[PDB]
Design a protein around this ligand. Structure first.
Ligand SMILES: Nc1ncnc2c1ncn2[C@@H]1O[C@H](COP(=O)(O)OP(=O)(O)O)[C@@H](O)[C@H]1O
Lengths: 278, 269, 370
């Protein structure tokens, strides 16, 4: 008799390591493997919570419809999130987008005004330049420092040809007057499975610092830096594909022989080509 | 059970196989009733094998294994040392030594490392065997992976008219643990699965081994091509499609004028 | 401009061009220079020391051949400048640079710097009002008339198969290998030297290229012609001497099916085609089997498409309705389509705003011409 407690960590590992799009369906398959929802929800609830908080799971209240992302800066832990733009406290289910009872809270709210135009210009560029690239800038005045939290999700999940792929990235303009910092991390998770496994995962995490001027300067400054860094690294990824074809393959599986032309198998079968000369 | 088996198939189909042993542990600790033929469906990695009576490296697989005793083609012995040494055709055993020798040369031609092992046997008219090439991501490069070339050579060796048949089953695992600064923390990879057949009037100058090296190499090239093209461009398609670096307010009008050109084409056709 | 400009087709070996509105490129000539090698003993004789055209195609063994474009890429830019000047000639153009919104082609997969340098020439040096340069497949789309297609064009030193949809191809479904019968004839000459025939000179090899365009077929057999041997189907030199053929008559042309045997990282024509299909969608492939476009001179082969389709059958999946469009003027078809595009006044933003273009440069290079 196996202890079913092990299955809690099994399904938790399954939930956490599940790529986006490939989560609820095979998650139900994991339930079929378990045949119970209670045993599943013993740890699946916390797994749902954190797995959505980090994967930038798309959420959208009807009162604002900004298509916010599930994170920790709106979350309260009681399945009740908050608006990063109009600080409404509202219940929000996680196996679906069942959200209700908007309650506008109160905080220092200065930073919110800053991230309004910051996310406005940012989100404008991201929408007008990335297809499914959509961001959400959370805001929090923790430790006497304003925090600009950029969360970008981008996917296209139509596995009709057994393919999925999603982009996520979080960049924090830690407004620490006078010199604020440009902190950030990327997130890549692409997957193809029609006859061949494809698990693309990559990122880049950097940080810089510059003195606060006003709202517009720092907005275009931070977003421009991240913008170019992302486009730059996207180009680097394209070149990485170029490094695959020539280096990586031939670094492991070469294409040509030592004579670089052909292979005479019968010559391998006999003749002893001169294996005793030198 | 059956539905749970299907769930495990989709699971493994979507699970990251760098945790095959831990994922298999999750599979056992989750459904131990279906712990029967786990690795029959679930694909396994390769295992190192060093002979001791001979002192030469070989490989660990299914057919060389006798219960728990793997066959060493250097000594043709079952490890742990058993008197259950059911060994195939000794002439074909020596031919297998020559084949693995040629393929070790071959892996030193296209790979320069790893271990090649085609563990065969001797059925009624024909037989089969497995191609095993273990070459992980070398320490020479931070970009790594785990090259595992597992293939099934299925020789339906005919008799009348010096002819025979061949059938290749294939799979090569490998990761792309490219974590350079320009690559960031890039990681990709996997394995494919293809098959092909042959009905050759097998002469003496071109043995079965020659056919193996030939079509296997051909298949590998097809695989490599398929990877490099379809999957890499596919990923880049998704990349540039989702996260583009293309400013709009232009493509609409330009494609509109292009459609006007198509209209002009229709004006004459 | 406001009159007939020129449509200019490239070619690493043979460049083409012609006045718009017509159906044939008015002037076509190879891509090299002929410069002699002997002492000007008799004064007042043929002097100028640089020949292109009729004298080049006339004084074959009297000059020194030099191709400025290699693998479709020009490196002897000054020689191409002079070739362009040959186009500007009274035998050909009788015009100035400032007289037409001329058109030019360019195969894809190339660094922009080539096109940049060409723009620098035709705009800084030549004061061309508008010079557009595009791809080398929409031209064929105009010729065939269809919108969905798989354009293949056997260049002078290039090969590239691309599936397009209504003049919108995928920026990924692109297949290309810079190769043609050039090295095929070179290897053919190699055979000949290992058969007793070396034709190391420039023009001496051009005659072998005429043989390439003369006695090269494409059988469907895998080893039938290899095990057998032809009886040297004796042709005769312009010199007026013996020209044997030898069994190898297929070996050099059949090599392009399996060109990797020469120690090449290529993929093979049919595989190239298949990969172009593979990089596309799924339902479109069904239509693209019924949409096959062939162009170029290296398609002119006895049993070309037959062996190609045999490879397709042995490689492509089922439910395929092959439709190969391989007419005669596959070369002109490109120029024809270019003339069709040149017959358009809707070419407004496409034509170069010369002044502002030079004031912009790089951005305009990536924006106007494509
Ligand atoms: N009649 C022929 N028979 C065989 N090959 C030919 C024939 N005519 C041309 N070719 C080959 O095809 C090529 C023609 O290339 P072309 O399509 O003009 O180049 P581009 O498209 O680069 O201008 C030449 O390299 C030549 O060897």
């Amino acid at each position: 008799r196996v202890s079913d407690e092990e299955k809690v960590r099994i399904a938790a590992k399954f939930i956490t390591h599940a790529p986006p799009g490939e989560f609820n369906e095979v998650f139900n398959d994991v339930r079929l493997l378990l045949n119970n929802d209670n045993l599943l929800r013993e740890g699946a609830a916390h797994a749902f919570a954190q797995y959505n908080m980090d994967q930038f799971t798309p959420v959208k209240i009807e009162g604002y419809e900004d298509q916010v992302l599930i994170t920790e800066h709106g979350d309260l832990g009681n399945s009740r999130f908050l608006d990063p733009r109009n600080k409404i406290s509202f219940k929000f289910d996680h196996l679906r987008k069942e959200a209700s009872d908007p309650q506008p809270e109160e905080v220092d709210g200065s930073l919110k005004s800053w991230r309004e135009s910051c996310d406005s210009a940012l989100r404008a560029y991201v929408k007008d330049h990335y297809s499914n690239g959509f961001c959400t800038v959370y805001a929090k005045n923790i430790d006497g420092q304003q925090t600009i939290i950029a969360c970008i999700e981008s996917h296209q999940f139509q596995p009709k040809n057994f393919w999925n792929g999603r982009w996520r990235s979080e960049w924090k303009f830690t407004i620490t007057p006078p010199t604020a910092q440009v902190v950030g991390v990327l997130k890549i998770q692409v997957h193809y499975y029609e006859d061949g496994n494809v698990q693309l995962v990559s990122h880049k995490d950097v940080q810089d610092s510059v003195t606060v001027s006003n709202e517009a300067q720092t907005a275009k400054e931070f977003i421009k830096i991240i913008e170019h860094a992302e486009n730059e690294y996207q180009t680097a990824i394209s070149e990485n594909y170029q490094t695959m074809s020539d280096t990586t393959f031939k670094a492991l599986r070469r294409q040509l022989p030592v004579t670089r032309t052909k292979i005479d198998w019968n010559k391998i079968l006999s003749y002893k080509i001169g294996k005793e000369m030198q | 059970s059956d539905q749970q088996l299907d769930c495990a198939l989709d699971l493994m189909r979507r699970l990251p196989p760098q945790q095959i042993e831990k994922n298999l542990s999750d599979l056992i600790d989750l459904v131990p009733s279906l712990c029967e033929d786990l690795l029959s469906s679930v694909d396994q990695p390769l295992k190192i094998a060093r002979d001791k009576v001979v002192g030469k490296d070989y490989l660990l697989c299914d057919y060389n294994r006798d219960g728990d005793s793997y066959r060493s083609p250097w000594s043709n012995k079952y490890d742990p040392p058993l008197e259950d040494g059911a060994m195939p055709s000794a002439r074909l055993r020596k031919l297998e030594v020559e084949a693995n020798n040629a393929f070790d040369q071959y892996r030193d031609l296209y790979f320069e490392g790893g271990v090649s092992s085609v563990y065969l046997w001797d059925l009624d008219h024909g037989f089969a065997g497995v191609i095993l090439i273990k070459k992980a991501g070398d320490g020479s490069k931070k970009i790594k992976g785990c090259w595992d070339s597992i293939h099934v050579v299925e020789v339906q060796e005919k008799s009348s008219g010096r002819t025979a048949h061949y059938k290749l089953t294939s799979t090569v695992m490998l990761w792309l643990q490219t974590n350079k600064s320009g690559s960031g923390t890039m990681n990709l990879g996997g394995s494919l699965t293809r098959q092909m057949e042959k009905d050759e009037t097998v002469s003496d100058c071109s043995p079965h081994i020659a056919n193996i090296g030939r079509l296997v190499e051909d298949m590998e090239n097809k695989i490599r091509s398929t990877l490099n093209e379809i999957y890499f461009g596919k990923t880049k398609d998704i990349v540039n499609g989702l996260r583009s670096v293309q400013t709009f307010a232009d493509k609409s009008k330009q494609e509109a004028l292009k459609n006007d050109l198509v209209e002009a084409l229709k004006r004459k056709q | 401009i406001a009159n007939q400009p020129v449509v200019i087709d490239n070619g690493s070996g043979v460049i083409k061009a012609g006045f718009a509105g017509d159906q044939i490129p008015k002037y076509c000539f190879p891509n090299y220079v002929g410069r002699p090698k002997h002492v000007r003993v008799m004064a007042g004789a043929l002097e100028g020391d640089i020949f292109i055209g009729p004298k080049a195609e006339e004084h074959r063994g009297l000059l020194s051949i030099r191709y400025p474009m290699e693998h479709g890429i020009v490196k002897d830019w000054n020689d191409m400048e002079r070739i362009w000047q040959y186009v500007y000639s009274k035998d050909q153009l009788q015009t100035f640079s400032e007289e037409h919104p001329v058109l030019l082609t360019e195969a894809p997969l190339n660094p922009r710097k080539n096109r940049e340098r060409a723009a620098e020439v035709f705009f800084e040096t030549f004061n061309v009002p508008a010079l557009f340069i595009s791809m080398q497949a929409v031209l064929s789309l105009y010729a065939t008339g269809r919108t969905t297609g798989v354009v293949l064009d056997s260049g002078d030193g290039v090969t590239h198969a691309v599936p397009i949809y209504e003049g919108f191809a995928m920026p990924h479904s692109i297949m290309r290998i810079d190769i043609a019968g050039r090295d095929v004839s070179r290897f053919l000459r190699l055979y000949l030297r290992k058969e007793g025939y070396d034709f190391h000179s420039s023009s001496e090899f051009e005659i072998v290229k005429a043989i390439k365009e003369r006695a090269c077929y494409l059988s469907i057999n895998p080893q039938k012609d290899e095990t057998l041997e032809t009886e040297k189907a004796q042709y005769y030199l312009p010199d007026g001497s013996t020209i044997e053929i030898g069994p190898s008559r297929f070996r050099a042309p059949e090599l392009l099916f399996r060109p990797d045997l020469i120690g090449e990282e290529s993929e093979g024509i049919h595989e190239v085609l298949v990969f172009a299909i593979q990089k596309s969608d799924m339902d479109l492939r069904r239509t693209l089997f019924s949409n096959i476009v062939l162009s170029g001179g290296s398609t002119l082969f006895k049993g070309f498409g037959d062996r190609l389709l045999s490879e397709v059958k042995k490689l492509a999946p089922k439910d395929v309705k092959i439709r190969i469009s391989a007419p005669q003027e596959r070369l002109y078809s490109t120029w024809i389509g270019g003339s069709i595009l040149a017959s358009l006044d809707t070419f407004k933003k496409m034509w170069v705003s010369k002044k502002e273009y030079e004031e912009d440069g790089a951005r305009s290079i990536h924006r106007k011409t494509f």
